[PDB]
Design a binder for this molecule. Structure first.
Ligand SMILES: CC(C)CCC[C@@H](C)[C@H]1CC[C@H]2[C@@H]3CC=C4C[C@@H](O)CC[C@]4(C)[C@H]3CC[C@]12C
Ligand SMILES: CC(C)CCC[C@@H](C)[C@H]1CC[C@H]2[C@@H]3CC=C4C[C@@H](O)CC[C@]4(C)[C@H]3CC[C@]12C
Ligand SMILES: CC(C)CCC[C@@H](C)[C@H]1CC[C@H]2[C@@H]3CC=C4C[C@@H](O)CC[C@]4(C)[C@H]3CC[C@]12C
Ligand SMILES: CCCCCCCC/C=C\CCCCCCCC(=O)OC[C@@H](O)CO
Ligand SMILES: CCCCCCCC/C=C\CCCCCCCC(=O)OC[C@H](O)CO
Ligand SMILES: CCCCCCCC/C=C\CCCCCCCC(=O)OC[C@H](O)CO
Ligand SMILES: CCCCCCCC/C=C\CCCCCCCC(=O)OC[C@H](O)CO
Ligand SMILES: CCCCCCCC/C=C\CCCCCCCC(=O)OC[C@H](O)CO
Ligand SMILES: CCCCCCCC/C=C\CCCCCCCC(=O)OC[C@H](O)CO
Ligand SMILES: CCCCCCCC/C=C\CCCCCCCC(=O)OC[C@H](O)CO
Ligand SMILES: Nc1nc(NCCc2ccc(O)cc2)nc2nc(-c3ccco3)nn12
Ligand SMILES: CCCCCCCC/C=C\CCCCCCCC(=O)O
Ligand SMILES: CCCCCCCC/C=C\CCCCCCCC(=O)O
Ligand SMILES: CCCCCCCC/C=C\CCCCCCCC(=O)O
Ligand SMILES: CCCCCCCC/C=C\CCCCCCCC(=O)O
Ligand SMILES: CCCCCCCC/C=C\CCCCCCCC(=O)O
Ligand SMILES: CCCCCCCC/C=C\CCCCCCCC(=O)O
Ligand SMILES: CCCCCCCC/C=C\CCCCCCCC(=O)O
Ligand SMILES: CCCCCCCC/C=C\CCCCCCCC(=O)O
Ligand SMILES: CCCCCCCC/C=C\CCCCCCCC(=O)O
Ligand SMILES: CCCCCCCC/C=C\CCCCCCCC(=O)O
Ligand SMILES: CCCCCCCC/C=C\CCCCCCCC(=O)O
Ligand SMILES: CCCCCCCC/C=C\CCCCCCCC(=O)O
Ligand SMILES: CCCCCCCC/C=C\CCCCCCCC(=O)O
Ligand code: NA
Length: 390
């Protein structure tokens, strides 16, 4: 068995590399939101909270991880704090991700109500509440759900620890039932599944709304044909009644509203002539709709489509961040499940424990790269900061 300092040196070196990168990338994120008013919106207040948690990974959770890797002698409740602080950050991250998803669902479902419901002041309150809850959840073990009452007396004496002290090792102080049922199942997996559900609802709303835009467009175009080759005022009247319903429903800002007012007015003109039995006049009147379509209605359609496609692209980007969080944390959670549920299975080896821990920390590096690659407004602001300063 090789001197422990050799593997420990590799682990510590990698941890420090990750800490540096987590700090730099997430400071860049915060700086970009600070500088650019185009990035100052409610969604991004949660992005900044998430970035703050990742900065705290580099500044605090990584130094604490290095420390607990040594098994140093510590008062048991101080050892718990060192062990569990990262759980606070990871819970805050989960709350920020959940908020972003909900935020984007409100935005796609009730866009005319979004700015009145989802305000900066309300978002700051939610963020504050979520941090408090993250402290309560992550430090639950320090309220007495811990193994400090059942110390490993053999380890503790071999190591030379004093009174009230334990060899500070994660699995010796933090109960595995806590880690599996409370931390993993209740506080991580349930919220991740809820996020999956919210994102599926966002994509279903986008698809339905885009389908409706197309359907209304087709209705207009198809009924203009019904009118053109109609042979009586009744056939023209019936097409025009359906066009009016589709025009009024689509209507549900200046050039937009003027366009739809022209359209309804022109439909009403044709409806009047059709009710009077003036078939050719109604047909001539209905053809005038084509000017309004071409000048106004098509432009509205293309703009509505474009807004919705942008929301789908944006939701995919945010969903990727959720996926990478799951990728990075799941291995550690899964290992804990094997340790807990399979006492006849050999414990995962030390090298794998440390690989899983390092992977979990690497999550705090990745989000700035996702913003840079997938969100133009962040990318452009990052370039301006880097070019001007560093
Ligand atoms: C605002 C930030 C920068 C302050 C950081 C304070 C941190 C480093 C402090 C707060 C509480 C401290 C712990 C409290 C109790 C103990 C038990 C003792 O037997 C060993 C040290 C240990 C485990 C301490 C290590 C350092 C510690 C984690
Ligand atoms: C979320 C994605 C990346 C899946 C990752 C799955 C990883 C964490 C899985 C795949 C196979 C698993 C291993 C399969 C077999 C054993 C042997 C055992 O006695 C302890 C656990 C251990 C060592 C498992 C640990 C968890 C493990 C390594
Ligand atoms: C996040 C999504 C993918 C769900 C996560 C799936 C998790 C909870 C699943 C995936 C693999 C599963 C493990 C597969 C095999 C064993 C060995 C058995 O003796 C005890 C249960 C245990 C240890 C399972 C516990 C639950 C488990 C870890
Ligand atoms: C030490 C551990 C963590 C440090 C947390 C960093 C705190 C991060 C705050 C950044 C910020 O406020 O920028 C964006 C807003 O101004 C937008 O209005
Ligand atoms: C041991 C010491 C205790 C840990 C100290 C700090 C944890 C980090 C908490 C960071 C909270 C920041 C929340 C935030 O900055 O979000 C504001 C919002 O984005 C408005 O725009
Ligand atoms: C900026 C803010 C950064 C905060 C500082 C970061 C990490 C320090 C954590 C280290 C805690 C180390 C405890 C080690 C200890 O107590 O050592 C006892 C030893 O057994 C006696 O020989
Ligand atoms: C910044 C000040 C934050 C207040 C200090 C919080 C950290 C602390 O005092 O922790 C006690 C310790 O965990 C007991 O074991
Ligand atoms: C809801 C969250 C409330 C958060 C408030 C948390 C309640 C405080 C519990 C506490 O004081 O912990 C003491 C600790 O056990 C010393 O050994
Ligand atoms: C999602 C929620 C996961 C809920 C699934 C909960 C299933 C857990 C059942 C269980 O833990 O089995 C008891 C057995 O004795 C092992 O110790
Ligand atoms: C979704 C998570 C559901 C996964 C729940 C995993 C249950 C595992 C389990 O019940 O293990 C029992 C143990 O193996 C008995 O000896
Ligand atoms: N199981 C576990 N162990 C450790 N550190 C100790 C690795 C180890 C495990 C066994 C051993 O004999 C010596 C060291 N950190 C840990 N962090 C987590 C964790 C954080 C979030 C979810 O799981 N689980 N976890
Ligand atoms: C992810 C990026 C690559 C990771 C490179 C390897 C990192 C960690 C594995 C190190 C194995 C040694 C673990 C022993 C740690 C200890 O006893 O303190
Ligand atoms: C880059 C940082 C270099 C870290 C050196 C770690 C050695 C500490 C040790 O294992 O005793
Ligand atoms: C890892 C992340 C890459 C860091 C990009 C360079 C940023 C330097 C400026 C800053 O950190 O504020
Ligand atoms: C270590 C943790 C420190 C994280 C710092 C994150 C940087 C985020 C925002 C920088 C803005 C701070 C206020 C300086 C503004 C100066 C100015 O307005 O010109
Ligand atoms: C500004 C704030 C900067 C804080 C820097 C704090 C010091 C950093 C790391 C302290 C390392 C802990 C030393 C433990 C030595 C244990 C021993 O001597 O037995
Ligand atoms: C800044 C460099 C930090 C060097 C880290 C050394 C940790 C040594 C140790 O684990 O005792
Ligand atoms: C930007 C601020 C960054 C904060 C600086 C953190 C650097 C310190 C890193 C690791 C400290 C590890 C101390 C080792 C534990 C003591 C080992 C032992 O007593 O057996
Ligand atoms: C701010 C960063 C602080 C600068 C240097 C930290 C040096 C860390 C030394 C850890 C000592 C651990 C040990 O001696 O066993
Ligand atoms: C002092 C700020 C931190 C608030 C404590 C959070 C504790 C969590 C408990 C319950 C969640 C809902 C609390 C809402 C209270 C404020 C509501 C309001 O004034 O509109
Ligand atoms: C942005 C900061 C938000 C405020 C968060 C602080 C709220 C703390 C809530 C619960 C803490 C529970 C942990 C109790 C610590 C016990 C200490 C001990 O054992 O002596
Ligand atoms: C747990 C995931 C919930 C799945 C959401 C289903 C989508 C829907 O309601 O139409
Ligand atoms: C990254 C590559 C690691 C992928 C899978 C890990 C599988 C190794 C498991 C070793 C089993 C030892 C044991 O039986 O406890
Ligand atoms: C980019 C950083 C990705 C980190 C690890 C590999 C995961 C690849 C993610 C695919 C999306 C990347 C992108 O949008 O350009
Ligand atoms: Na995080």
């Amino acid at each position: 068995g090789a001197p422990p300092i050799m593997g420990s040196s590799v682990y510590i070196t990698v941890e420090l590399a990750i800490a540096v990168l987590a700090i730099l990338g997430n400071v860049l994120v915060c700086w970009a939101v600070w500088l650019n008013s185009n990035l100052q919106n409610v969604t991004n207040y949660f992005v900044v909270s998430l970035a703050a948690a990742d900065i705290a990974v580099g500044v605090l959770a990584i130094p604490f991880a290095i420390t607990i890797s040594t098994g140093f002698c510590a008062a048991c409740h101080g050892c718990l704090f060192i062990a569990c602080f990262v759980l606070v950050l990871t819970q805050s991250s989960i709350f920020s991700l959940l908020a972003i998803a909900i935020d984007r669902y409100i935005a796609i479902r009730i866009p005319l109500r979004y700015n009145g419901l989802v305000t900066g002041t309300r978002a700051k309150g939610i963020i504050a509440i979520c941090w408090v809850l993250s402290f309560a959840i992550g430090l639950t073990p320090m309220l007495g759900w811990n193994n400090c009452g059942q110390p490993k007396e053999g380890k503790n004496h071999s190591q030379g620890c004093g009174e009230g002290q334990v060899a500070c090792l994660f699995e010796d102080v933090v109960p595995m039932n806590y880690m599996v049922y409370f931390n993993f199942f209740a506080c991580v997996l349930v919220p991740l599944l809820l996020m999956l559900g919210v994102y599926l609802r966002i994509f279903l709303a986008a698809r339905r709304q885009l389908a409706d835009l197309e359907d209304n467009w087709e209705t207009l175009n198809d009924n203009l044909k019904v009118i053109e080759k109609a042979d009586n005022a009744a056939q023209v009247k019936d097409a025009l009644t359906k066009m009016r319903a589709a025009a009024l429903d689509a209507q549900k800002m200046k050039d937009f509203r003027h366009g739809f007012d022209i359209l309804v007015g022109q439909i009403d003109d044709a409806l009047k002539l059709a009710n009077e039995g003036k078939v050719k006049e109604a047909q001539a009147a209905a053809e005038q709709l084509k000017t309004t379509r071409n000048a106004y209605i098509q432009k509205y359609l293309e703009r509505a489509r474009s807004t919705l496609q942008k929301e789908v692209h944006a939701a995919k980007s945010l969903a990727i961040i959720v996926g990478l969080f799951a990728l990075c944390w799941l291995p550690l959670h899964i290992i804990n499940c094997f340790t807990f549920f399979c006492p006849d299975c050999s414990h995962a080896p030390l090298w794998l424990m440390y690989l899983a821990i390092v992977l979990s920390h690497t999550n705090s590096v990745v989000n700035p790269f996702i913003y840079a690659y997938r969100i133009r407004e962040f990318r452009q602001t990052f370039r301006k900061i880097i070019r001007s300063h560093v």
